[PDB]
Design a protein around this ligand. Structure first.
Ligand SMILES: [Zn+2]
Lengths: 85, 214, 417, 1031
């Protein structure tokens, strides 16, 4: 998807409906290519349920309750004596 | 592997008439009677036939392969020249060669060289289509005998004729049993311990001399 | 390029008959009816992802053995000089057809007559049996197994494996294929190679034939610690997160950090575990099994008669007069050889080693108590049922448990590079 | 047509399935609530009073129960669950679901059907658990209950509950409660994630091993299931190669080269498996033409779409418009031939037929031969001959040659005569009748019998047939490293052809007459031309008609048709390139030319055996059902094809095919089919293995349920059983078509698969396939082996029962009675009762007496032994005569049952309780067809001194059967009165014994309820997704 996005913007940058240079549908078979997505966490798990939500549910089972001008240096020209200093 | 078409060996003339006294042509006078498969090593030819029909029978000349190592696959054409039989290229080729050796075995002189020591074609692959009662089988026996040095008690004319072949085949197919100790094996060529032949000493592959076979 | 197809049946552990009875056979043929159990074995064993056990088959190494016995028995029927296949039984079993496609219960008239009196340590040549000699493919598929058998029956020890190193093997196609296995376990890989082998038997210097050989080396070179994430073989190396554990799991992986320089040339040797605890190590077994598939089409170097028992010497295609020697080793000890080595390269701490060794100890302790105990159970049975004597697992002796050559072969392997 | 469809596209089984829930099939349930609040332990003692979530039930009594996937959360429901209810409710309905169609009572079930039922039950127990354990995700523990372990998260809301049933070692241990005690004694470190395979930074873990609740059994099942699939896995490159090899180069696809993320793509199966299904395949079609025809038509089209050859009849008409002739003539060779040709379907079909001559033999339709036979005096008939001569050789009919011969012989009658064989197959018999070898006339094989003087033409025609009939050949196809090989009688990769194939060396064709079939046309014409110029035939035609006839024949000979060329150079390839994609792979039998000795005369398949024959190879010859049918084609059409073939102007084979084939290789239907075959075979073996448990087969096999009774099974009960096994399989794999139906014919007790064909000379060829394994089968037999121990957990009790009065205050479990109360056949002074048993009434005060088994007559008192059946066959009479003595008298009977379903009734120990009413009903409701669950009255265990009171019992068991019991007063500190049972440590070995390896199980003697589970996360992409083609 990111590839398509790119090649598609490539088009808009060159004011054409079809991009001449493309980052997708190249002769190359990049079938194994991976992109970072918000689908996985840092422990190789699925973010199907947010880390915070897991942590919550996980602790919720362990709970208990109570019982019942001019510049000769660089040659730049100025206009104010103050602009000079 | 290189598939090379086997060309005609005999070219029939006009006078030919399948006469008793006409010479047998062992089907080698027709279109395609066999297909040859050349390579520079048997291990490969063998593996080649893993994926290739061999029902017709595959012959091999382990002695001096007429042009390099190769296997011969018989076609489905046939020889009718010798009645009342109908021989298949494979059977035919076997037959012609077999007789050729049986002949050489007699004119064998120690100082006189011959083209090949063993002229018999040996059946290497496709024996599962041939029964213990088929000509194709008995020919294997005869071929073996001939290789090992047996001689026909019968006189073999210098020039063959259909009537003769017809007769011979007729004997081969009559009742009786194999009185010798030789039986056909695809595996390799068996050479009796006390056999005169010396092929095993002139080739590096194909023959095996059994010490306990006398 | 192999030309001689011989195999060796198993020998009796001092018994009067092949160490297997009806109760045991019925158990093997439970779901499959063929004696060529490779497939059916690979299922039970379960990707060696946990200790596999049963009532009649307590360990993988047990089923491997039993499988061997069944073949050693039944096969003696069609291999009799006359080559008859369905005229006699072997414990109520008879062959389904000349093409040895399966075993079934004997017809009444055959159960009525006596069984075949199998013998021990026999060596046969496939090409002696017509049906095997006439259909090469059939032969090659089956030999793959008879070999794995032979590789277990040559000595009273564990399954032999063949380790080779040779940069010339690495070709284009090989490189292309190998990369796919990145991430799979040794088992997971072996499993497929086996199947692919059975369908289309490998050639002499074939693509599969080579890669499989390469995998084996990669495994072993890593099992010993010569290669690792910081010193790879062309970036490849097998990883194990829990070395020592009862059920090890090795993963083929990558690393660009370094690639050890390899000496040109071709080098190879044979290895084999000598300690009884192999009956519980799926990798050590599959490793043999694979070198087994290798044998169908390739002729390995001969094995020096002096390394094997009398009975199995001068076996035309296997043991010879001046061959290579077998390098044995104790499983436990190797573990240390493994650690020591890594620690010397500076990738493992002393603390880590201790932590491993410790476990590795606990593991052996377990595996032994069990094996010995089951062993006893067996004798206990054999005394009570003298007509159906057997062995759920290949017999071993107190001596087998020692080190002996473990270190010697540990370096032998390390020398392949 | 139901079959027809299944050949072209069979429902593909649903192999890959995932489970994100717990891998367990047993659940602990509360039977009798906890004793809280109470008069002794203040409520402030029990954990439950603080809302603490416990790993196990907090109750006076808890038992284990079977309930497949009660915790599972899957993607696909295999709708084959096994759900039991707490032992305090009736479960009878699970053991009467099969052969109890004759069982009247609803509360009852027929015992002789028990084994059958139990068996099928186990089968579903397996089927319903065939999933892959999916990996979800974790979260580090933010509390100190565990040392920062990673706890796995289940999906779905209302999840916080699981985290406590999941990990018991996580609970706190403040109490001295039976529960805390257990927990407290477990190793701390074995919880949460255990190990993982992280390969890509920022991707999922390939798999993870983890500790958590589960059951060793179902874990093992799933373990081997994954094991079996793992073997079928293939990778992109293997597929690249495979496909590439099949296409013969015309199509090129690609696989990537780089680190993947592990993909599970099960497709590789053993050749064996392919052959076995190819036989089943053949089976259900043999003899029924209308099933195979549509298959050919399909391939017919496929060809038309890919072949560059086009038939254009105008070719014949053009060359014919230049034939020289006179207008004053009566006949027109030119015209007549056109009107006879009436210038396709039949052509393309005939080719397809070459691939299945195993079951289908194409033949020229009778309608294509002259009605009366024809006469060489009829120009019309001469063209008729022509048409036939040109077509015959394209049919698979092994008798074509003889027909091509006779076809002319029939017209020559009276003109030229030959020596036929006998008086029936005479020289005038319709040529189309010589359909079998036994008919080939002597003179046809021994040409010499045909007089070169009295029958010159006829002879020459024969010499031609002999020397010029096409020579069969072959071509290699397919790629078995991935697809295995369906070939049966031929070698793998071999595809036979009834024609000589000489590959073309160029890509830019040009008319070529150096073809096998081109000569054939030539010869045929030359013959005709000779028949005309025959000194004794030519005088009957006007000198002009001859010239015309000749001219025409020449134009036919020299016609510029491409067909013959195409047939020799391209056709063979096209076929080879298609073969691998067909749903129903080729099935051939050698094409022999004129070697009649080798003509196929029969092909048959077996799927059963005979009497006492157990070896396939022996019963094959006499238990096969012949297969095959003829399909007729139109000679007319076929010829027109051979006469007007034409290639596109600027054709370039190497390009053309590259376009034409590409799309065909974007149809992965092939791969799908493999998976089907895979199942078809699992189904078969699963049948034999189960069937062999209720009946006697020819296969070696385990046996563990022999103690559960079962009726004497007839070939009928056998089939009925099979039918269920069948259904369940389809249901679990979501199949709607056939499977096992082909084999179900009549009796399945001797199923076996094999096929054979036979030559004319009588030589036969057998093919017995090697049965590959079966995971399904092995798994059933596994759970069966476990059932043999954990039987109580499945609601089944083992042994017998003893109906007798036993009153006391004691508190033992009737399911674990005290020894001295039970007696058996070998106990002293016990009376056994057999068949001849009868009863002689009492008189004048005397006592009545029943007859012994040895012929002794005893009074109604003492200890008797009755085999259940005996009572069933006399319920009324017995209940009437004995009940009274059992209740208040001194009679005690032991009914022999073997196995039986049981139901529990708990009671308060401090109050009187008499179980008669319960057992009275049982006895009274026994029938020669049914029995209701045996009822037991057991006491409620207590955790504090309690008074005592009498209790009258009548039924107890013969051996322990209280294994179903998990724990008593689980939340109290100790059980003081009644059966006391602490949490079964044996079941939590990995946790209770520190010296045990994490990966150790205890099957088949004990099912651990907490093990190490391996959860995968492999991807299952569609082939088209990783293997890409290059258009
Ligand atoms: Zn400035």
């Amino acid at each position: 998807d990111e590839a398509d996005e790119a090649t598609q913007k490539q088009a808009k940058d060159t004011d054409k409906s079809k991009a001449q240079v493309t980052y997708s549908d190249t002769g190359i078979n990049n079938a194994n290519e991976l992109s970072r997505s918000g689908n996985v966490d840092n422990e190789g798990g699925s973010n199907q349920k947010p880390m915070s939500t897991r942590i919550a549910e996980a602790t919720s089972a362990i709970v208990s309750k109570h019982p019942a001008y001019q510049c000769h240096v660089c040659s730049a020209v100025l206009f104010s004596p103050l602009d000079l200093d | 592997v290189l598939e090379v078409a086997a060309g005609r060996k005999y070219l029939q003339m006009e006078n030919y008439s399948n006469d008793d006294d006409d010479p047998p042509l062992f089907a080698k006078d027709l279109s395609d009677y066999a297909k040859a498969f050349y390579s520079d090593t048997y291990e490969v030819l063998d593996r080649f036939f893993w994926t290739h029909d061999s029902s017709a029978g595959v012959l091999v000349h382990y002695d001096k392969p007429t042009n390099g190592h190769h296997y011969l696959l018989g076609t489905l054409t046939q020889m009718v020249s010798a009645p009342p039989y109908i021989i298949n290229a494979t059977d035919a080729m076997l037959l012609e060669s077999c007789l050729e050796q049986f002949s050489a075995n007699v004119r064998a002189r120690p100082a006189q060289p011959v083209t090949r020591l063993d002229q018999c074609y040996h059946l290497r692959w496709g024996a599962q289509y041939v029964g213990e009662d088929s000509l194709t089988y008995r020919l294997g026996v005869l071929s073996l005998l001939a290789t090992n040095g047996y001689q026909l008690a019968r006189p073999i004319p210098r020039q063959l004729t259909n009537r003769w072949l017809s007769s011979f085949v007729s004997q081969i197919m009559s009742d009786g049993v194999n009185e010798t100790p030789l039986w056909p094996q695809e595996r390799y060529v068996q050479i009796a311990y006390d056999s005169p032949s010396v092929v095993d000493g002139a080739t590096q592959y194909g023959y095996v001399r059994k010490n306990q076979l006398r | 390029a192999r030309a001689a197809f011989l195999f060796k049946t198993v020998g009796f552990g001092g018994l009067q008959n092949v160490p297997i009875n009806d109760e045991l056979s019925s158990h093997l043929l439970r779901a499959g009816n063929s004696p060529w159990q490779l497939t059916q074995f690979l299922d039970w064993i379960s990707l060696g992802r946990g200790l596999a056990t049963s009532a009649l088959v307590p360990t993988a190494g047990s089923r491997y053995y039993q499988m061997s016995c069944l073949l050693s028995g039944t096969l003696q029927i069609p291999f009799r000089p006359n080559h008859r296949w369905g005229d006699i039984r072997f414990l109520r079993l008879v062959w389904s057809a000349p093409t040895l496609d399966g075993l079934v219960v004997a017809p009444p008239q055959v159960l009525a007559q006596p069984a075949l009196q199998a013998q021990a340590d026999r060596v046969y040549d496939c090409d002696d049996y017509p049906f095997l000699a006439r259909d090469p493919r059939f032969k090659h598929r089956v030999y793959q197994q008879l070999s794995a058998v032979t590789l277990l029956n040559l000595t009273g020890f564990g399954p032999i494996s063949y380790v080779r190193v040779d940069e010339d093997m690495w070709s284009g196609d090989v490189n292309q294929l190998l990369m796919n296995y990145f991430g799979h376990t040794f088992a997971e890989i072996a499993y497929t190679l086996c199947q692919a082998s059975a369908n289309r038997p490998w050639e002499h210097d074939g693509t599969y034939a080579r890669m499989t050989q390469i995998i084996l080396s990669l495994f072993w070179l890593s099992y010993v610690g010569v290669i690792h994430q910081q010193n790879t073989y062309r970036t490849f190396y097998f990883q194990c997160n829990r070395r020592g554990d009862a059920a090890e799991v090795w993963i083929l992986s990558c690393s660009l950090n370094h690639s050890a320089q390899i000496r040109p040339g071709n080098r190879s040797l044979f290895v084999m575990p000598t300690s009884p605890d192999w009956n519980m190590d799926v990798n050590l077994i599959l490793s043999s099994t694979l070198t087994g598939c290798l044998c169908s089409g390739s002729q390995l170097p001969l094995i020096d008669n002096n390394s094997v028992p009398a009975v199995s010497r001068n076996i035309h295609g296997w043991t010879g007069r001046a061959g290579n020697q077998l390098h044995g080793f104790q499983v436990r000890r190797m573990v240390t050889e493994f650690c020591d080595r890594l620690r010397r390269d500076g990738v493992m701490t002393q603390a880590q080693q201790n932590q491993i060794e410790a476990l590795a100890d606990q593991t052996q302790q377990f595996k032994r108590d069990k094996l010995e105990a089951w062993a006893r159970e067996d004798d206990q049975y054999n005394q009570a049922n003298p007509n159906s004597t057997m062995f759920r697992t290949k017999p071993f002796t107190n001596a087998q448990w020692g080190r002996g050559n473990t270190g010697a072969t540990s370096a032998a392997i390390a020398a392949l590079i | 047509n139901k079959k027809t469809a299944q050949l072209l596209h069979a429902d593909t089984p649903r192999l890959v399935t995932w489970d994100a829930g717990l891998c367990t099939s047993f659940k602990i349930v509360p039977i009798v609530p906890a004793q809280v609040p109470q008069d002794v332990l203040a409520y402030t003692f029990f954990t439950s009073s603080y809302a603490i979530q416990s790993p196990f039930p907090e109750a006076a009594v808890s038992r284990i129960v079977v309930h497949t996937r009660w915790a599972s959360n899957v993607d696909f429901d295999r709708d084959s669950s096994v759900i039991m209810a707490p032992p305090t409710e009736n479960n009878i309905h699970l053991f009467k679901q099969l052969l109890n169609t004759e069982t009247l009572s609803v509360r009852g079930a027929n015992p002789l059907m028990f084994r059958a039922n139990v068996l099928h039950m186990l089968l579903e127990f397996v089927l319903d658990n065939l999933y892959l354990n999916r990996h979800t995700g974790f979260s580090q523990d933010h509390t100190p209950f565990t040392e920062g372990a990673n706890l796995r998260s289940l999906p779905g809301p209302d999840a916080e509950k699981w985290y406590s049933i999941m990990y018991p070692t996580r609970m706190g241990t403040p109490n001295v409660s039976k529960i805390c005690n257990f927990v407290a004694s477990c190793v701390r470190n074995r919880v949460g994630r255990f190990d993982r395979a992280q390969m890509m930074n920022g991707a999922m873990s390939e798999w993870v091993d983890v500790f958590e609740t589960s059951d060793a059994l179902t874990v093992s099942i799933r373990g081997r299931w994954m094991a079996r699939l793992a073997r079928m896995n293939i990778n992109p490159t293997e597929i690249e190669w495979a496909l590439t090899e099949c296409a013969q180069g015309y199509v090129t696809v690609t696989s990537p080269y780089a680190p993947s993320v592990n993909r599970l793509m099960p497709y590789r199966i053993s050749n064996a498996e392919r052959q076995i299904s190819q036989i089943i395949r053949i089976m259900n079609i043999g003899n029924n033409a209308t099933v195979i025809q549509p298959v050919l038509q399909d391939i017919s089209v496929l060809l038309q779409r890919i072949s560059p050859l086009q038939i254009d009849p105008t070719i014949i008409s053009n060359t014919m418009s230049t034939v020289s002739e006179s207008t004053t003539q009566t006949l027109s060779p030119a015209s007549s031939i056109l009107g006879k040709l009436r210038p396709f379907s039949s052509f393309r079909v005939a080719l397809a037929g070459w691939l299945y001559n195993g079951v289908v033999t194409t033949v020229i339709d009778d309608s294509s031969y002259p009605k009366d036979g024809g006469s060489v005096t009829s120009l019309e008939n001469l063209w008729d001959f022509f048409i036939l001569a040109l077509a015959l050789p394209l049919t698979t009919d092994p008798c074509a040659p003889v027909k091509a011969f006779m076809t002319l012989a029939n017209m020559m009658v009276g003109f030229e005569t030959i020596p036929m064989d006998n008086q029936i197959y005479t020289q005038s018999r319709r040529a189309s009748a010589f359909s079998t070898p036994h008919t080939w006339p002597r003179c046809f094989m021994n040409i010499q019998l045909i007089s070169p003087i009295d029958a010159p033409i006829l002879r020459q025609w024969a010499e031609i047939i002999h020397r010029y009939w096409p020579n069969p050949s072959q071509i290699r196809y397919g790629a078995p490293n991935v697809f295995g090989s369906a070939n049966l009688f031929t070698p793998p990769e071999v595809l036979l052809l009834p024609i000589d194939h000489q590959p073309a060396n160029v890509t830019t064709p040009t008319l070529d007459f150096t073809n096998e079939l081109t000569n054939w046309r030539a010869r045929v014409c030359e013959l005709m031309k000779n028949l005309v110029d025959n000194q004794r035939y030519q005088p009957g035609w006007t000198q002009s008609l001859v010239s015309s006839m000749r001219g025409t024949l020449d134009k036919l000979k020299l016609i510029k048709s491409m067909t013959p060329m195409y047939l020799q150079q391209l056709a063979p390839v096209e076929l080879a390139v298609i073969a691998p994609m067909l749903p129903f792979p080729p099935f051939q039998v050698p094409y022999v030319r004129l070697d009649r000795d080798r003509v196929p005369t029969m092909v048959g398949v077996t799927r059963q055996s005979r009497d006492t024959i157990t070896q396939p190879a022996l019963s094959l010859s006499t238990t096969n059902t012949t297969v095959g049918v003829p399909l007729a084609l139109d000679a007319r059409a076929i010829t027109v094809a051979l006469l007007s073939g034409k290639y596109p102007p600027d054709l370039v084979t190497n390009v053309w095919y590259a376009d034409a084939i590409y799309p065909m290789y974007a149809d992965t239907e092939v791969f799908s089919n493999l998976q089907r075959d895979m199942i078809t075979c699992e189904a078969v073996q699963t049948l034999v293995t189960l069937v062999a448990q209720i009946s006697e087969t020819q296969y070696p096999v385990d046996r563990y349920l022999d103690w559960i009774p079962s009726l004497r099974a007839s070939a009928a009960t056998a089939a009925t059983f099979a039918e269920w096994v069948n259904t369940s399989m389809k249901t679990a794999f979501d199949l709607s078509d056939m499977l096992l139906e082909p084999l179900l014919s009549g009796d399945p007790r001797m199923t076996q698969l094999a096929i054979q064909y036979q030559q004319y000379n009588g030589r036969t060829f057998n093919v017995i396939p090697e049965m590959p394994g079966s995971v399904i089968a092995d798994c059933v037999q596994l759970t069966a082996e476990v059932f043999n121990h954990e039987y109580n957990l499945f609601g089944i009790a083992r042994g017998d029962i003893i109906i007798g009065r036993v009153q006391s205050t004691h508190l033992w479990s009737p399911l674990a009675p005290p020894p001295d109360l039970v007696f058996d056949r070998d106990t002293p002074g016990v009376h056994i009762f057999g068949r001849d048993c009868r009863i002689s009434f009492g008189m004048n005060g005397a006592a009545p007496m029943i007859r012994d088994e040895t012929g002794m007559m005893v009074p109604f008192e003492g200890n008797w032994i009755f085999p259940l059946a005996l009572w069933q066959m006399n319920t009324r009479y017995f209940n009437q005569q004995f009940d009274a003595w059992i209740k208040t008298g001194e009679l005690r009977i032991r009914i022999e049952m073997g196995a039986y379903p049981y139901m529990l009734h708990y009671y308060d120990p401090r109050q009187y309780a008499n179980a008669w009413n319960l057992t009275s009903a049982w006895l009274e409701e026994i029938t020669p067809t049914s029995i209701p669950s045996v009822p037991f009255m057991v006491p409620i265990s207590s955790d504090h001194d309690i008074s005592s009171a009498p209790a009258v019992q009548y039924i107890i068991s013969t051996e322990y059967n209280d294994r179903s019991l998990f724990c008593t007063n689980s939340s109290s500190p100790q059980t003081i009165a009644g059966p006391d049972k602490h949490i079964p440590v044996e079941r939590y070995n990995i946790l209770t014994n520190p010296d045990a390896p994490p990966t150790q199980i205890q099957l088949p003697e004990v099912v651990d309820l907490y093990n190490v589970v391996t959860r995968y996360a492999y991807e299952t992409p569609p082939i088209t997704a990783v293997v890409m083609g290059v258009p």
